[PDB]
Structures are given as structure tokens and as C-alpha cells.
Design a protein around this nucleic acid. Structure first.
Ligand SMILES: [Mg+2]
Ligand SMILES: [Mg+2]
Ligand SMILES: [Mg+2]
Ligand SMILES: [Mg+2]
Ligand SMILES: [Mg+2]
Ligand SMILES: [Mg+2]
Ligand SMILES: [Mg+2]
Ligand SMILES: [Mg+2]
Ligand SMILES: [Mg+2]
Ligand SMILES: [Mg+2]
Ligand SMILES: [Mg+2]
Ligand SMILES: [Mg+2]
Ligand SMILES: [Mg+2]
Ligand SMILES: [Mg+2]
Ligand SMILES: [Mg+2]
Ligand SMILES: [Mg+2]
Ligand SMILES: [Mg+2]
Ligand SMILES: [Mg+2]
Ligand SMILES: [Mg+2]
Lengths: 183, 131, 256
RNA sequence: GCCCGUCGCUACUACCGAUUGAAUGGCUCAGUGAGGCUUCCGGACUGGCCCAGGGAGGUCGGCAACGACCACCCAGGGCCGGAAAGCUAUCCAAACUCGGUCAUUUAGAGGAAGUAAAAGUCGUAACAAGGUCUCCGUUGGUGAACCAGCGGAGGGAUCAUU
RNA sequence: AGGACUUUUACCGUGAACAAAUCAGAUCGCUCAAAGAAGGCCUAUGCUCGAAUGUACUAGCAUGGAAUAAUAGAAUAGGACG
RNA sequence: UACCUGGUUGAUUCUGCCAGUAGUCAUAUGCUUGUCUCAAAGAUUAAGCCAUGCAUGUCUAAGUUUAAGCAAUUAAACCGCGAAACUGCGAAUGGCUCAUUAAAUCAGUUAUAGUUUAUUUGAUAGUACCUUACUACAUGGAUAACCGUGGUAAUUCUAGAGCUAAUACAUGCUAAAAACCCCGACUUCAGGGGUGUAUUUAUUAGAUUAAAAACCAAUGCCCUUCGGGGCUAACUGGUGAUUCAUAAUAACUUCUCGAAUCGCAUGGCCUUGCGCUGGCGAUGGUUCAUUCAAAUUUCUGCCCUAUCAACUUUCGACGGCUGGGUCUUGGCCAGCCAUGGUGACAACGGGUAACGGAGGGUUAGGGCUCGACCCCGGAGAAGGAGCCUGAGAAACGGCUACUACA
RNA sequence: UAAGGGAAGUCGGCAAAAUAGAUCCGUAACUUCGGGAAAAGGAUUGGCUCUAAGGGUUGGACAACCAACUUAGAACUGGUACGGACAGGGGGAAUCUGACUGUCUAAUUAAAACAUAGCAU
């Protein structure tokens, strides 16, 4: 595999000629189709002596609820959408910008113990009571996700590069956009 | 429509400080009003995108706009030839990305600035439109 | 395979080294450090091709690692250590200090400093940023990193760094009226006064330099080196950075 | 005086030419496809821990069976690892076969030209009004130069007839 | 040093930058020369000049010049001016 | 040093070529060849084939010594020299050739705000984080060298068996104290947990364009001669230009680094304990900068040919988007969408007895021609392809496979 | 139906075998420019689960109720098999001859013979 532009036709339509044997730095490597399963992380040596971690069947990931800066390590359940290819959804392939299902248990535990309000020692409650009044009720779109137990999340990392599946929860019009795609 | 595609668009790290992002490319070019007040999305626009402008600043005449967000520039120039003391009418065709901020037709004169390789051919971004 | 070169050709060696063309096929190659290689000066050339102590490769190699040559007060056993601008070379065995300053011809000369000029150096500020822990730091032209500079040193300033602790004694701001030395281009080794500064956005700004003979010149701030605010902070070589034409140079010889 | 062409002898050059001609190289469709990277299993071989136990001395309590304390050496189960051969599926792809195309050389019976060499045969077409003025385009004919028809030119043998 | 108002190209002047070696060219009695970058001075003690200078067409960068050669401008005024 | 001469004719003036003339750092060949200095030299064609020999190894006080090695050493406790072997480094430099190659290489000029970097140089890391039976006055298991038994005709082939070291491989405790976020029993206000760096994700700060009066929605605070005033402060880097430099919060990891290494000098103190401390170095280590660089990259510029006029696009051709891959950008690749891109200013195709250039020869000016070759760049190692180690190779005096040769 | 060979059999490849449908690609000399041409020569084809496109009617880039075929794309799957039986061109380079389509010796000769258009008298 190589990434050189010598094998391509010119912009005018001309066909380039053979110049040199394949170079080591213009490679070029086999893609890793990360999916859902028991963890397999392979490591590959790179040009600077650095190391790249290939993700093969990742199961758990670190996800961010940005509306209040709460991030928890949850379980990736199933890929629901992918703008690139529909076949990546069917085989449950994990790549960047993929809409997935994740467990809502760690986020519900934090929300209940921080605001003291349902989602489906006198100093403590007023500490929680003041927090709820300042913030307000969660968006209904995020509400219906919670009682079903699974949250929409977009993966923002590169599992084939860093070996980690990280992302953030859908919320706002971005959530509404992907819900239209899923129906 | 802005969200006329298969993925949400776009601005990467502008979480919904809370306002639409833009910058100035420097070198005396003024950011178009469309970029400031527009809802369009383009990751290769010199103002609303991540792309920086550095290198050579050229100009020419717009020839074709049948593309999507890229135009072709004709750069007429005269080539001097010793042994004859005359010139030749030569020309080159240049590919440059055009941001949705400008309304450009064929025959207009534009100024482009060098950026990183955006595609197989494009290495320049439209900065100003004269007419 | 492919990798960095390790040899150097005598013909392709820098001109200012003034190397014999028929001595051999190869020339000394600087390793790394106080560069750029264009221009710098190897230690072997300084001790063999300028002092002859040190007549050939073997004797200079013996001298280097007998631990007798102190570059900026630091022991260097590198036979081809890239001695550069403003660097101070010390030989305690004979008891004198040398400094590398360009002359009018554009070549390094054997300049001598007696006792106190070897206690410091002038360096050109190349970089100011925030360090690993929000700690401002400063980089000079000789790769020296200073972890705590004065806040008023912005860019291109010349700092007097002490040669046994690295601390800054004083700095000179880059502005018109300062004594400047041209360290590059066609005007190598020319000392004058900054007069005009025109700004061209694009990274090729021009500096106008006036000589002691009321001669106007132009150079980029990549070759302008500030020496003094009102008077030079170091000792200039013979000629005081004033270039004479071919005629006046000949006349000086005929008179002398 | 000069001069043209067929024919005949000698030498040389190139051209056409049956031979599905031949050779070399580049690119390329299809088929088979070594080797290797990645990957799915696989796990010989080899480590660690846990579970209660086998052999062999010193004493005490009980009506026998038995149980308790102090110090050595060895059989059987469970779990967690590393890992070679091999193996699954992609990918890179040498190589060969089979066609296609391009480029360059090269053989060929025979045919039709050119050039050169001179004391060869036959005519005398052109140079004078060259003895039918010469030449051009086209067509037909003839051993050969050439001839003839139609139209044109003067580079004509007329710068002119009242 | 921040901003506004500059018709745009060709052309000419100037400036910066623009490997060595080669070429032109300065100096020195390698016994002259081709060459080389040496050498010379003091008896010595060690003292010193040199190893120059020019050359960057065309393309690129900065500024000035405004003749010459091109192109636009107010005409269904959709023109300029506070 | 801006130059001519002979030759068509009986003679003339021309057109026009032939010949003569001179230079070549331009090759061969013939004859001849006393001396000094300097010196090219299997490119042309066969990048055709190669016997043989050599061309890449390397040790300091400062990695590992029980040689049944030497030399002087002590019964012992191990070093002065020092082999073998393990470990580290280099072997990707240099040298050779010009086969391929025509916007390709290359040259001048740009960019990396789109990247990697062994080595050199300067700085640079305090963290109660959590695992072993535990320890830090110091953890664990192997393997050479060596002893002995072989195999095959044969290789710089190696097996079985007994040891034994690490700067080879693998583990592993840490530094006080400050400050910050979270959890918090406790009538209206103790205690515990986390906070180095390295990685990934998410979020916040990283300012500054001319001034004044109103219901506040929210505590308005302080100063209250209980009118009224000030006020939620002071400071705040860089680039022409960034989501920059940098800081902070919530988490994450097949959890990187944070020294179980070596030499010299051996000195100080008091609770005299084989107690506490003390420099110079060697090697090594994270981040940042720097160095040698590498890699792409902008503009402009290449000989002949139309008996090459249309070329690219099924299966990437021009572009947009998402992702993957890469050190990184990119139709580099995978998916979806649109129909574009080049050309008479010569595209596309073909030829080169074409590597590009700095430059060589010869010229009044303008030019013609050559450039394999002492320097810079590129490519190759019988012809293609693939790959390991490694900072650096698609390496060939490395490996694997196929073809030819041997 | 036959191992290995593949016309060596024979006056002679007579007889038999081989090719064969559909889709996609590719297609020469020659030429009366209409052809040659199905030239030559290649690849795919099953089952199952899906996806998409191609319409009509009534109410105002929409909504609801109907419709039966054709094409394209993708996973999975199998002793790599799939026009699975049936059905179903062998091809190429030339020479002689007649231009071609057509016709005749019912019951041994279907041909180069006859005819034909065209030409001429
Ligand atoms: Mg190579
Ligand atoms: Mg160096
Ligand atoms: Mg006549
Ligand atoms: Mg006449
Ligand atoms: Mg002339
Ligand atoms: Mg004549
Ligand atoms: Mg005569
Ligand atoms: Mg001649
Ligand atoms: Mg080399
Ligand atoms: Mg550092
Ligand atoms: Mg695209
Ligand atoms: Mg992309
Ligand atoms: Mg060649
Ligand atoms: Mg050659
Ligand atoms: Mg290899
Ligand atoms: Mg027979
Ligand atoms: Mg019959
Ligand atoms: Mg019959
Ligand atoms: Mg008939």
C-alpha cells in the first residue's frame, strides 16, 4: 500500500511515467475495522519510533456530557447511524463521527446524587436544591433517552489511531438532526 | 439549506464563546459581511474555516464556475525571449476554492492566497471579488 | 538506504573557512550546536588553520580532548564543534581568550580579548514563549534557553548573558539609533547605526544602517545584530566594522 | 558543336512483394498465481497461583476405632498467562500463459526504378524558324526519344500597318 | 499604530536576497611559466599584511517613475456630494 | 582581435555551393619521442558476464569477567593487563554508474499555521498515584562464553545436557508543605477523596470599538453627619493572520517517564550508630527549544515531431462530504452526490544515440553547440515485487519469492 | 462412455466430439461505406435475507388507498456449484467459381447449370 500521487492521472488527463521504486515513507497500511466486543489493542511502530494503538473490538468508552461537564466511562451498546457507509452500521463498526448507543447508568448516578431530582444532613439537600434551581429541568429530548436506559453518542476519537473510543452525548439540534436520520 | 447532508454541520469546537466563529486572514484583506452574518458552513473557507493563508498571493480572471465550491483562474502573462526581443502570449490555469461568502460569475477578477493542499489540484483560496 | 550525510567535500566547503584546495579531498564537517553551518566555524579550523598548534588532524585531536579549550567557559572535546558568533574561546595553557567576530571581508578573524570580555556574551533573542509550567522563557541565537527573562525583551533584542551563571546583565532594545552589526548577506561584518525600519507584512522587513562614513545600507532583520545602545558593548576588530573600497585599501598598504 | 531516350554488360542504393513472415522492447485485457504485511482461530512447548491430599519421626487424652501439637519429602484437580508450526479473510503483488496495441530492426522468389562507369546497338526528340516554333495542363497512341486532339503561355521567329 | 479614501495590467530605475568551484580580475620572484594561496620582516627575541573585487539574464520580493501599449468609469443615471 | 582565398566561362558580373583556413578541456589512429612540473584515463558499444583477493567494524577510570590466560599481589575476601562471549553503536556514510525519466528530474524563488527527527547544544520532572509474601542497606527468571556428547560430503549450519552476569528482559515503594474541586455526619456551618508528567475526549479562560440613565429578574456590598457616593475590583503574552503559546475543570489508558546502572576523590557532623551527610564525572530519561536534516509544497522556466487534433472519465477522470490510512496535508484510499477537467497560447501521443544544473568549446554585438564524467540534486545495484531491524532503508558487500544466468 | 496421444486413420476430419441462452467487455484485414460482426476472444450466472428506482386515483416539492412487472445494488450461504435437465453458432487464413434472393433432372446428379436485375443489338 502506498499514498503517493505518482500513480494517478494528471489534471490534464496525461498518464505519468514510472519514477522510482516504492518508498518506505509513502506507505500505507491496512485499515483496522474496530467493532464491538472484548478488547483487543494491537500496537504498531511508526516512523519516529512512536507507537500507534489499533482498536479491535472495543466495548467501553469515555463519553462527555458537555451541558454540565460530566464525563463517565460507559458501555458502548450498538452503532445506530454512520454518515459514511450504511454497512458499517450493520456490522457494528466503530469509527469517528458514528452515532451509537451507550449505557446511561453512570450518568444517571451522577445526576441523581448531584441535583437530587428524579430522572424517570440538612446541608446536603439545600446544596442539591440550589443546584436544581440554577440549572433547570433537563431537555425533553435527553429525557426520553434516559428511561429507555441508552443514550445517543457520537464518537469523536479515532479508534484505529489512538486505540480508544471517546465521544460526547447528543443534545440540542444536533440530537434532533440525527433522530430524523434514524426514522 | 445548511443541513442538506448526511451529517450535522459543522463547526468543530464551537459548543452550543457560544457565537459563530470567524477570523481575519491579515495582509490587508477585510472579512466579507457574508462570513460574519452567514449561516453557511465550509471547512476550507479562509475566514470561517481552520485553513490559514500563507505564501504567494496571486490574481487572475474567473473562467469556469460549473464546479461546486471551486473555480478555475486564467493567469495571462507574457514570456520574454532572448534572440528575438519579443514576447509570447502565454497563460496558465489555476484551481482555487471559493467560499460561499462571495457571489462569483465567469469573467470576474479575483485575488487568491496560497494555503495547504485542499484537494488533488486546489491550493488557493479566493479572497476578494472585484465586480 | 537514505539518511543524513556524514562527509563534506573540500570544494563545497564554506568559502569563509579559507581552506586549502589541494590539501585533500574532504573538509571538516561541523556536528551540531551553535549553528547554522552557513555560517559557523569548526574548532579544528580555528586551532589548526588559524593558530597552527595543531598542525594537522592528529595534533588538534590530541589538543581537543586534553581538556584545554573552553568554549564559553565550557570544556569541549569535539574536534569539529561548531564555534559560532560571539562565542568565547579560551586557552588557559597559553592564557588568553578569543572571540569570533566577522570582519569586513565576511570571514571569521582571530580577535583577542584580554581579561574581562570573556566573562559575558551578546546574544540575539530569537524566541519568547511560555514554558512547560506557564513560565516565560527566552531563546538566543546560540540555542541558549533562559527560563526567566525580563518582561520587556520582546524580539530581536540583544541580551548580555553572564558566562559563568547564564544570568542576564542587561539588554538592548531593537530600535533606531542603536549600534548594529550586519551578520549576513552581502554586508557581512559591517558595523553601523540603525536609521530606518520599514514594515512589510510577509516576513522580509528591511533595516537601513548608516556607517561611520555616512554610508546608507539596507538589510533584513535576519542579519541585523545589535551591539550597543550608544556605544558597542564589546571590542571591535581592526577597522571598527567599516568597509573600504579596493582603492583606499590599496592606498592604506602603499602608505603603510 | 552540343545533346535525348529505349535496348544490352557491370556495380551500388532504396522501393513493392506471397510467406496468418521473423526478432526485440514498452504498455495492456483475462486466467493461474509464488512470497509477504495485516487479520480470525489455533495452540505444541513452557511459567504462576489456588484446592484439599500420599510417604516417613517425637509426645499426649480415650475401653478399640480416633483426635491434638512440633519438623522433612511426594501423588491428583481448578484458575490465570507467554508462545512456535499451522489455519481463516482481505491487501500488496513477482512470475507464466493467452490475446491486443505501439515502436524499432530484419529474410524473401519475383517486379519496377534511380545513380555511376564508357570509344556498345537503334533512331535524332531539344539547342538556329534545329529544319513540324518551343513550353504548360489534360486525354489517347507508339521500339525509343516522342506524336496527336482541346484549352492556354511567350520564356517567339511579331513590341508596328491608317 | 488603527482605520478610511487609491483603476488595473505591461514597461523602466533602485534595493534586499541570490553554494563553492569555473570566468574576468588584485597581490606574492613556486629559479620564470602552467600553477598555488602563499609570504614577508628582525641577527634574534617573535612581528605583521593577505588569502581581495566583479558577476544573479528570465521568474519571485519591496519602492519610485506615469511617457509609451492596452482596460474600466455617469446615457433607460440603478451617477457623485453633507 | 567586426578579415577571407581557389573552383562553372573564350573572357565578365552574379546566385550558389564545394574546397581551402583556424579553435576545441574532442575522440581514435599513424610515424617519431632526450629533460622538468602538473596530470586525464572501459562513458560512448554490452545498466553485458564474472574466477580470485580485499573493500566495516568498534573499548574508555567510567555496561557484563572465576579464560582451568598473563603479570607482582592475600588461606580468604577481587583487580593491573586482558582473550571469548553477551550488551550498545555504526553498518541508511562513503564509493560507482547514468539504465529509467520531457512539468517528470532539476534551477531560482516560496510554505509547513499540514509534519517526523537518532545525534549535538541549553534548559527541564518533589506529588500520600498502587502492586508484589514483603523489602529499598536494593526484586525475579532465563541465556551466552565455558565443560562434555554428536549429525551431515559440504556453509560465517547447528542440537541435545550442566552451570553462570547485567546499563540484555521483566517487576517495583517514593518529598515535605501550600493551594484548588468533590463528597460531607454535624440544630440555622469535623472529617474523607482526588489533583505530577505521558495519551485520548469534552468544556472554560486566553480581553480591550465613544459616551449616559431606567422597571430589574436575582443578594445588591461597603461607606450610612441613616441624603447620597463608590463598587462585584487590579493585572492580563505572541503572530500580518489560528481553536496559538499557556492555564484551568470532568474523566480515560493492555498507564509512557519520573535512575534497583558505572568510575574517581574520599571529606565533614554528633545521639559513636559498621548513624546522618558531602563533589566531580559516565551512561541514561520526559517535555520545550535548537542542530544535522528529511519529506512534501507555491510561482516561473525544458530538445524534435501534426505522416500525433482531440485527450481524461467503465475500474478516479474535476470537485464536494463523512471516515480510514499516514509522521502529516491530499482522490492517497473506502462509501454517497454532481458532471466536470485539459486543448490550436499545441493539450494528448511519438522520438531522443535525453539524467537536470552550476558549467566546457567558439564567438564584435546578437548567437551555435556540448554537458556520462573531480561539485549540488535525482535514480539504480542481473530484471520486478515484498519485508524485518532500525531515528533514519522499500537497503541489496540485508532477507524472502519468481525469471534469466551461474 | 472411454486411460495417454490427438487425424498418425482415410481419396477426403466421412462419423462423432467440441461451441452454444442471457448480461458486461473487446473486436482485424478488406469494403460497393451498407457490411464483415454473433468477427476473433474474455468475465458473470444458484439459494436466501434485504435495499433502491421506475406508477395510478381522490382531495391543496403534501397526505391517504390501491398496483404488477422490470432493472440495479449489498450482505449471508454451498464439496467453487449454478442457461446444473431441456434448449442451444465451432472458428480463422486463403485459392477456384457463380454477384446476391430464387429454380430444375418426382424415383442415383441441387451444381459452377437455369433465372435475375444491369448492358447491348
Ligand atoms: Mg537505493
Ligand atoms: Mg555541527
Ligand atoms: Mg525553338
Ligand atoms: Mg530566347
Ligand atoms: Mg558574424
Ligand atoms: Mg553555368
Ligand atoms: Mg577554364
Ligand atoms: Mg568547410
Ligand atoms: Mg551515497
Ligand atoms: Mg530540552
Ligand atoms: Mg469527492
Ligand atoms: Mg477528507
Ligand atoms: Mg540513455
Ligand atoms: Mg549512455
Ligand atoms: Mg526487501
Ligand atoms: Mg496411410
Ligand atoms: Mg433425382
Ligand atoms: Mg440429391
Ligand atoms: Mg447463368
Amino acid at each position: 500500500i502506498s499514498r503517493d500521487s505518482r500513480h494517478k492521472r494528471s489534471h490534464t488527463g496525461a498518464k505519468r511515467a514510472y519514477y522510482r521504486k516504492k518508498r518506505a515513507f509513502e506507505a500505507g497500511r491496512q485499515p483496522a475495522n474496530t467493532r464491538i466486543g472484548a478488547k483487543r489493542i494491537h500496537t504498531v511502530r511508526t516512523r519516529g519510533g512512536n507507537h500507534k494503538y489499533r482498536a479491535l473490538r472495543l466495548d467501553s468508552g469515555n463519553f462527555a456530557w458537555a451541558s454540565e461537564g460530566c464525563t463517565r466511562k460507559t458501555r458502548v451498546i450498538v452503532v445506530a447511524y454512520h454518515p459514511s457507509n450504511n454497512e458499517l452500521v450493520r456490522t457494528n463498526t466503530l469509527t469517528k463521527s458514528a452515532v451509537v448507543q451507550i449505557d446511561a447508568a453512570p450518568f444517571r448516578q451522577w445526576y441523581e446524587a448531584h441535583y437530587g431530582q428524579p430522572l424517570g444532613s440538612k446541608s446536603v439537600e439545600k446544596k442539591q436544591a440550589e443546584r436544581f434551581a440554577a440549572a433547570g429541568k433537563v431537555d425533553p429530548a435527553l429525557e426520553k433517552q434516559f428511561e429507555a436506559g441508552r443514550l445517543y453518542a457520537v464518537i469523536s476519537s479515532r479508534p484505529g489511531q489512538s486505540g480508544r473510543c471517546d465521544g460526547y452525548i447528543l443534545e440540542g439540534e444536533e440530537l434532533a438532526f440525527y433522530q430524523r436520520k434514524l426514522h | 439549506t445548511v443541513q442538506s447532508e448526511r451529517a450535522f454541520q459543522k463547526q468543530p469546537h464551537i459548543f452550543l464563546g457560544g457565537r459563530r466563529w470567524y477570523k481575519d486572514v491579515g495582509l490587508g484583506f477585510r472579512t466579507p459581511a457574508a462570513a460574519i452574518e452567514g449561516q453557511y458552513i465550509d471547512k476550507k473557507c479562509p475566514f470561517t474555516g481552520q485553513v490559514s493563508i500563507r505564501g504567494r498571493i496571486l490574481s487572475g480572471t474567473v473562467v469556469s464556475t460549473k464546479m461546486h465550491r471551486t473555480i478555475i483562474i486564467r493567469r495571462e502573462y507574457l514570456h520574454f525571449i532572448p534572440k528575438y526581443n519579443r514576447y509570447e502570449k502565454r497563460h496558465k490555469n489555476l484551481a482555487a476554492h471559493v467560499s460561499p461568502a462571495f457571489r462569483v460569475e465567469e469573467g470576474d477578477k479575483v485575488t487568491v492566497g496560497q494555503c495547504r493542499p485542499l484537494s488533488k489540484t486546489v491550493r488557493f483560496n479566493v479572497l476578494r471579488v472585484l465586480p | 538506504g537514505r539518511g543524513p550525510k556524514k562527509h563534506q567535500k573540500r570544494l563545497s566547503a564554506p568559502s569563509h573557512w579559507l581552506l586549502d584546495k589541494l590539501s585533500g579531498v574532504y573538509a571538516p564537517r561541523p556536528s551540531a550546536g551553535p549553528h547554522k553551518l552557513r555560517e559557523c566555524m569548526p574548532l579544528i579550523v580555528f586551532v589548526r588553520n588559524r593558530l597552527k598548534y595543531a598542525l594537522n588532524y592528529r595534533e588538534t585531536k590530541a589538543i581537543m580532548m586534553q581538556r584545554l579549550i573552553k568554549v564559553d567557559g565550557k570544556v569541549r572535546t569535539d574536534i569539529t564543534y561548531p564555534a559560532g558568533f560571539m562565542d568565547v574561546i579560551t586557552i588557559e595553557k597559553t592564557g588568553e581568550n578569543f572571540r569570533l567576530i566577522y570582519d569586513t571581508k565576511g570571514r571569521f578573524t582571530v580577535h583577542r580579548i584580554q581579561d574581562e570580555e570573556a566573562k559575558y556574551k551578546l546574544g540575539k533573542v530569537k524566541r519568547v514563549q511560555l514554558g512547560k509550567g506557564g513560565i516565560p522563557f527566552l531563546v538566543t541565537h546560540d540555542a541558549r534557553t533562559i527560563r526567566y527573562p525580563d518582561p520587556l525583551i520582546k524580539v530581536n533584542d540583544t541580551v548580555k548573558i553572564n558566562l559563568e551563571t547564564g544570568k542576564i546583565e542587561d539588554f538592548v532594545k531593537f530600535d533606531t539609533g542603536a549600534i548594529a552589526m550586519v551578520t549576513g548577506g552581502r554586508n557581512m561584518g559591517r558595523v553601523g547605526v540603525i536609521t530606518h525600519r520599514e514594515r512589510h507584512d510577509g516576513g522580509f522587513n528591511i533595516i537601513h544602517v548608516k556607517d561611520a562614513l555616512d554610508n546608507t545600507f539596507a538589510t533584513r532583520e535576519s542579519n541585523v545584530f545589535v551591539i550597543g545602545s550608544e556605544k558597542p558593548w564589546i571590542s571591535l576588530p581592526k577597522g571598527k566594522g567599516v568597509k573600504l573600497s579596493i582603492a583606499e585599501e590599496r592606498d592604506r598598504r602603499r602608505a603603510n
